[PDB]
Design a protein around this nucleic acid. Structure first.
Lengths: 93, 77, 63, 102, 46
RNA sequence: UAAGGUGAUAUGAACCGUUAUAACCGGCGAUUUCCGAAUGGGGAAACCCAGUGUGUUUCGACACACUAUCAUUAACUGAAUCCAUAGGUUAAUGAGGCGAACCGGGGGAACUGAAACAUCUAAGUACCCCGAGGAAAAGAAAUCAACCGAGAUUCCCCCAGUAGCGGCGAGCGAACGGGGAGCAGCCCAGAGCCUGAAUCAGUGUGUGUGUUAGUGGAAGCGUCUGGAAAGGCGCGCGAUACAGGGUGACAGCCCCGUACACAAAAAUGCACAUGCUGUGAGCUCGAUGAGUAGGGCGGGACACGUGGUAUCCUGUCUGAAUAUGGGGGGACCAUCCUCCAAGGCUAAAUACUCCUGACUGACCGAUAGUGAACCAGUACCGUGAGGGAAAGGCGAAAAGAAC
RNA sequence: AGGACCGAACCGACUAAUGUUGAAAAAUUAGCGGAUGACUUGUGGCUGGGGGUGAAAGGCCAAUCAAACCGGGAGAUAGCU
RNA sequence: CGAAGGUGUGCUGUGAGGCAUGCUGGAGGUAUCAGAAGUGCGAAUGCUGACAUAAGUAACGAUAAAGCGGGUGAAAAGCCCGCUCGCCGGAAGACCAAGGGUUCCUGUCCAACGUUAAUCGGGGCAGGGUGAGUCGACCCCUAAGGCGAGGCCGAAAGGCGUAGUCGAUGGGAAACAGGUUAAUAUUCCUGUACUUGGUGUUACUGCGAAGGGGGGACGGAGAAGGCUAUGUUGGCCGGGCG
RNA sequence: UACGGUGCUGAAGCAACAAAUGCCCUGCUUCCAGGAAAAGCCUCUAAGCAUCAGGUAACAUCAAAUCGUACCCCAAACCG
């Protein structure tokens, strides 16, 4: 099993957008920003054990950071990971 | 490399001088030969890359003393 | 809270360890990033408090 | 330690307020102090479309230097320099010139 | 017209990359001069 | 140490703290992802893939640790072959890589000069490579000197641009001897007597001092100009403190400091003292470094270019005497003097500055000084090695311009 | 069948004109040669500086070639300007 | 009660120069007599910055080509919508690899960038967006070639190379149709599938290799035959009768 | 019908002919210039293990991780 100390550090934020919103209200999937080194077994286990719901399957993409600039000083943001967590028929959150 | 295993003779450097004294670099090489030495105390042939005066010093000092020197300074035979 | 954590057993710092991570830390990351959580200093003090529990836990366990 | 500090009453030695007494509001790690009613600047700031919009010319206090003030003795009624003595293991400030602990 | 720089990442790295500078004496001296000059990117890796 | 803080651009929000578990400074700890010698295998650096063992009250998956090569040592195994060696496996210890200069060694140019050029020069320089230390190297006479003597090595000033070497051209260029810096001698080749006897090395402890935070630290007011006073004028005070910096113009007395006097729970450097371990004093007698010295041939180093050329080093061929002996004393011989090679260790004077602190400059002040006063080895250029900028200053205070 | 014939893609580059401070540090337009072969092309690899490679021109080796580029000796030397 | 500096005027010395003073400036300057020099620039096809000149001149980058109405706007030849016109159509369409790296999509701004204007943009700012057992990589295997324990060799650095280990551009398991987003889709959703391993049960049972064999396993050209993609025509179905 | 579209419903859905440079075809014929390797795959056993382990078949169940995925790609996004 995955230890609970690992399993708390994985989920990072709920992702709020309109693709996320239509995924919730149309296909049971909650979209959430996860740890960059988090595997699909860790995300599945962490939503099973931290929101106490039943997860059908996880799909993970990794989002690349945008090169912004302040003034005349550039900088890339930071890569993050986004997990499309497809729940079962019985869920709320 | 061309090093005598007994006396430790490297190749050294020098000059070809000519009759007009034109200096050119050269190497003096040792007279290295690979000879197979019978040791009676071990009843074996230990083959070494000796000079042709490493064989003089083996003829004088004996092969056992020489092998004790090579084993002493970590030269593997 | 530095002597207070210093005077428990290893099992009890594992309990308040898992409760610093569980109850405090995760619920404040989720609460912070969902528009709630006016009080942002809690994130800092929880994080440093987990540092204390892991410090005393390393000092208590063995060397 | 620091001679002029937070809740303390000072008089001003140089410039625009020379001889004006007042209480130290706060003390900034630039080596400056904000003393109430003293170094009044007439800022005028824009009514930002966020939280409340004052507009107008707001008259603030500015930071004067620490060396431009000295704490008011009130037993002599003049400016006075500060020293540090030890009393019962406490490093206390004391007025020079009458040697009184503050 | 076909210019000289026809890029390929795999040849960029196999040729001038870090594991290929470190692979020999003289490339390690290259990295030593780039570190000593003090250089933001040593090799061309990414 | 502390009444204020949560590093900067950079304000905010949310808070922490005010007599002590805010913050800041120091000692010792803890954590210390991944790459990189990178070391479990691989690789296009910061990634991919494992094996082995221990443990995991959902042990259908996790967590931790170990696993590189080489050298040395030991154990267990182990061929052709009988014994045995090679080899194999495991364990213990060490190494590996980076770094600016200084140092020793292995290799080693050419442009240039000679008004051409080849000997020569440049120059054993540049560069490449190996190795080591806080210094290295050298070093305790087979050394000079000269019939008197000196007494290891290293560095400095003379000697002396001298004697000499030199297509006797261009150039190269000593020693003896003198004055100083510093000064230190020892051990093995070997037995007996005798033992821990000085000696250092490794550690404990105690003392002294220094480093890493700090503490206290004198003495001024009035008036005029002025936006502002430290300035002018008038009268006072400090000084083992008038080094310096800031403060609204130029301050000994406003602030930080300076002189001066103190301070360490802890970790440390140095110096004494002392405990233990290792180590060996001292006496008598003996020995006193062989393919070596020397030689022939080739080359190199010596200021010395083979010359009449001593001396040292050795690639090659040889080859003694061994204290009634041998080396040197500038071809060489004799006489005389001096020294003991073929084993090794050794402080100081000496060379250097990646780096830290304090101080100083008839050094620079933004086209100067570092390439770089400013988020500069950056932007940018180049496949790459590499090349490589420009760009400081509102105000005393943002009071940086409400309407 | 064919280093066969005609001819697109594909490889090339014979002529002319334009362009020549270009649209382009070698091209465009109109014609032109090869087009199953000693062809052409993609991806990777190997050869290196008195060296490579060369159906040979002193050609090519990163718009550089009778000896590449970078750094150093190095402020070479310059009886010349 | 106003320094240096800057800019005028007046006086003065044989000259380089000096002195006084108005205005700007806003904080430093320095006699005399000595001392030291990065001590004086018009030239070096000098170096750096600035600014002229030609000159409001050539040009504005394929001779595929535009015209009108309406909208937005401060402003429309260029943006958006519509109707016409022209151009490509073995490409000037569509999908990728390499390479790039957010240029994608939406809202918003017009300073600079766009050889003009710009409300527009691959520009500025903010937000969003890349979903895999089956596609590709990783992975298993190897070619050329690299590296290479030991090893042979070499003044040192290092050369070569055995075992091995890497190295695709090659060999190796498996998913298709339809729908959907402003922006992803063989990845999401709907339907229908397939592949390879682990574990467990049951029935039968000889399994077992860095070893043997097969297979993988592979040339140029040519020739037909059988098909399909695809297309054309008829039938059918819906619509039209201009 | 925020006129952008959004839902609902939805007929026929066949045949003949032509036909590839794609597929059978890694075939067939022929020609000299004589045309990769290794693994997966199938088999054979050796040492060993032999009423165990393993193999085969059926069924059930679990797993299939990680990284790429936008967009241009004969081009205003790559090299110039």
């Amino acid at each position: 099993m995955i230890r609970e100390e690992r399993l708390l550090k994985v989920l990072r934020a709920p992702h709020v957008s309109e693709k996320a919103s239509t995924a919730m209200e149309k296909s049971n999937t909650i979209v959430l920003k996860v740890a960059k080194d988090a595997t699909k077994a860790e995300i599945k286990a962490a939503v099973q054990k931290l929101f106490e719901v039943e997860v059908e399957v996880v799909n993970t993409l990794v989002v690349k950071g945008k090169v912004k600039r302040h003034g005349q000083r550039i900088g890339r943001r930071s890569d993050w990971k986004k997990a499309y967590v497809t729940l079962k028929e019985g869920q709320n959150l | 490399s061309r090093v005598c295993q007994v006396t430790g003779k490297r190749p050294v450097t020098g000059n070809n001088r000519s009759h007009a004294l034109n200096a050119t670099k050269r190497r003096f090489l040792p007279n290295l030969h690979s000879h197979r030495f019978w040791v009676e105390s071990e009843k074996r042939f230990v083959t070494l890359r000796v000079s042709a005066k490493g064989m003089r010093v083996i003829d004088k000092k004996g092969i056992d003393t020489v092998l004790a020197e090579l084993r002493a300074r970590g030269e593997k035979y | 809270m530095k002597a207070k954590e210093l005077r428990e057993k290893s099992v009890e710092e594992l309990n308040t360890e898992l409760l610093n991570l569980l109850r405090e830390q995760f619920n404040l990351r989720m609460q912070a990033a969902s528009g709630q959580l006016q009080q942002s200093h809690l994130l800092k003090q929880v994080r440093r408090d987990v540092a204390r529990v892991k410090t005393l836990l390393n000092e208590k366990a063995g060397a | 330690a620091a001679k002029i500090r937070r809740d303390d009453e000072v008089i001003v030695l140089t410039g625009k307020d020379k001889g004006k007494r007042g209480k130290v509001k706060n003390v900034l790690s630039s080596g400056k102090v904000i003393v109430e009613g003293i170094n009044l600047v007439k800022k005028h700031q824009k009514p930002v479309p966020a939280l409340n919009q004052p507009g107008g010319i707001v008259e603030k206090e500015a930071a004067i230097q620490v060396s431009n003030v000295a704490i008011f003795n009130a037993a002599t009624g003049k400016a006075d320099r500060v020293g540090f003595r030890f009393e019962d293991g406490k490093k206390v400030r004391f007025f020079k010139s009458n040697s009184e602990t503050i | 017209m076909k210019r000289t720089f026809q890029p390929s990442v795999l040849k960029r790295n196999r040729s001038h990359g870090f594991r290929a500078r470190m692979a020999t004496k003289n490339g390690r001296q290259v990295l030593a001069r780039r570190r000593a000059k003090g250089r933001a990117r040593l090799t061309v890796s990414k």
